[PDB]
Amino acid sequence: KIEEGKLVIWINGDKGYNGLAEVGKKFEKDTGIKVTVEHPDKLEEKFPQVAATGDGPDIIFWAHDRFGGYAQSGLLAEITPAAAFQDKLYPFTWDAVRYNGKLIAYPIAVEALSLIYNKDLLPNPPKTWEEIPALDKELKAKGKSALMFNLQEPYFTWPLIAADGGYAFKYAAGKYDIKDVGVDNAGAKAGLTFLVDLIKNKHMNADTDYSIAEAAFNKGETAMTINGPWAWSNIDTSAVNYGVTVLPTFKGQPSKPFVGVLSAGINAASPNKELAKEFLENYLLTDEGLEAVNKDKPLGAVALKSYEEELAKDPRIAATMENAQKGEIMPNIPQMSAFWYAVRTAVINAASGRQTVDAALAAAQTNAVDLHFVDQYREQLIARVTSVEVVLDKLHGQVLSQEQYERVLAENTRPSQMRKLFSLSQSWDRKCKDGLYQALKETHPHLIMELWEKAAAL
Ligand SMILES: OC[C@H]1O[C@H](O[C@H]2[C@H](O)[C@@H](O)[C@@H](O)O[C@@H]2CO)[C@H](O)[C@@H](O)[C@@H]1O
Numbered sequence: 482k483i484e485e486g487k488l489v490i491w492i493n494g495d496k497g498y499n500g501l502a503e504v505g506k507k508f509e510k511d512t513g514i515k516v517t518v519e520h521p522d523k524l525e526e527k528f529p530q531v532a533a534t535g536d537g538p539d540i541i542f543w544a545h546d547r548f549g550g551y552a553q554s555g556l557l558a559e560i561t562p563a564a565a566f567q568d569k570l571y572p573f574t575w576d577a578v579r580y581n582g583k584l585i586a587y588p589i590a591v592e593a594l595s596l597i598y599n600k601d602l603l604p605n606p607p608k609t610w611e612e613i614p615a616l617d618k619e620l621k622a623k624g625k626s627a628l629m630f631n632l633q634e635p636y637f638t639w640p641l642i643a644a645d646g647g648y649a650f651k652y653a654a655g656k657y658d659i660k661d662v663g664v665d666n667a668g669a670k671a672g673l674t675f676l677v678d679l680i681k682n683k684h685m686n687a688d689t690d691y692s693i694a695e696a697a698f699n700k701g702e703t704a705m706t707i708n709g710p711w712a713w714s715n716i717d718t719s720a721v722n723y724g725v726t727v728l729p730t731f732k733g734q735p736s737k738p739f740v741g742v743l744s745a746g747i748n749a750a751s752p753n754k755e756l757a758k759e760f761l762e763n764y765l766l767t768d769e770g771l772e773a774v775n776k777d778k779p780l781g782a783v784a785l786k787s788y789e790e791e792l793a794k795d796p797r798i799a800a801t802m803e804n805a806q807k808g809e810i811m812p813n814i815p816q817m818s819a820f821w822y823a824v825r826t827a828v829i830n831a832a833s834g835r836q837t838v839d840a841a842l843a844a845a846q847t848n849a850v851d852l853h854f855v856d857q858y859r860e861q862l863i864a865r866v867t868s869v870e871v872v873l874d875k876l877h878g879q880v881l882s883q884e885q886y887e888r889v890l891a892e893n894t895r896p897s898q899m900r901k902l903f904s905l906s907q908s909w910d911r912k913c914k915d916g917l918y919q920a921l922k923e924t925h926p927h928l929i930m931e932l933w934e935k936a937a938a939l
Pocket residue numbers: 493495525544545546547592634635636637709741821
């Protein structure tokens with residue numbers, strides 16, 4: 482369980498965890514309470530997996546979009562700031578952490594993607610996405626390339642999908658309509674078609690991930706990348722002469738990045754809730770706390786009015802906000818986790834040529850709207866299904882091909898095997914998903930029964 486009388490903190494590894502650790506050191510200096518900051522892999526999934534059991538960190542950091550799901554699952558303590566403290570942060574940041582009438586986290590900072598460009602390679606950044614292929618051709622002659630960014634996380638491709646009309650869930654009458662999804666409309670298709678064409682014409686490579694794109698930009702090999710405030714620290718170290726600016730337009734319309742509010746929630750199973758509150762309100766969310774984190778990795782536009790004003794002159798922060806204003810705040814509904822995984826699979830499949838754009842998005846759309854049991858509880862099943870071989874043999878023939886069977890089996894741990902199986906099946910139709918559910922239920926009926934029950938408990 483969770484050790485009492487101390488703080489364990491989880492934050493993503495792309496954030497200023499060293500800076501946060503300093504705030505932890507100051508807290509220890511003034512209170513005697515030791516603070517431990519960790520940045521585990523696959524944090525957005527690890528948390529609900531271990532927290533559902535009743536363990537995990539006292540405090541979890543992520544963008545606000547995942548917190549609605551955490552709250553619905555009972556993993557988060559209710560946050561009760563007094564009025565004077567609440568007034569120290571922007572109202573729209575509190576709005577991002579409000580779920581079903583209550584505050585479920587502390588907002589820290591507002592993030593949005595921008596175009597980052599090498600001024601020595603590219604004195605004026607391109608206005609449009611459409612002119613990048615011509616740009617890449619010029620640069621290739623100098624042994625360079627126009628653009629590299631993470632193509633493994635749909636967050637980075639989202640601004641282009643949304644530009645001409647794609648959207649996640651429709652918002653109307655103060656509610657998100659969970660049945661109105663805009664992943665396979667004409668606009669989403671046009672944007673992703675443009676991305677795929679960049680890859681087909683070798684302006685980009687489908688295998689490019691975060692580390693690969695960062696290395697290429699920071700070594701001066703590519704003229705542009707797409708990234709958030711957290712990335713500026715490494716670019717500074719590399720002393721690249723860079724600018725941060727508005728994303729290119731597509732079909733004459735702005736790219737629309739999703740806006741995230743980095744937020745901190747308190748584990749509902751934590752016996753250290755009061756301590757967590759003190760650390761967050763009186764140590765982190767102060768000019769001195771935020772500055773320490775921000776000097777490690779930039780936070781963007783912080784939620785704290787006083788420090789936001791001090792930093793607002795930074796043209797890079799201005800550029801972040803300009804992009805944010807063209808985009809949309811992410812929904813925090815519990816459906817977000819399944820939505821992101823479906824879209825992630827669609828972008829990866831279309832980029833790798835495993836599916837056409839139309840088929841990739843049509844499948845994502847169907848699965849986000851229909852929310853099958855195996856998609857809703859994918860994360861729990863990955864962590865809790867243990868008889869993988871039994872499931873594979875039930876599916877072999879009917880649902881799984883010989884090759885897919887072999888691919889799943891080849892993974893090293895049970896969760897890696899399960900994760901592969903759900904990835905492969907992600908684009909399958911309802912009937913195949915039903916076959917997958919049936920095999921899981923025959924193999925582990927108590928687990929499946931437990932999942933049905935807890936859904937109803939919450
Ligand atoms: O790609 C899907 C992913 O997008 C967002 O995650 C961002 C995150 O908000 C940023 O702070 C930064 O860490 O990069 C991530 C993308 O790799 C969503 O917040 C997240 O839930 C979602 O899975």
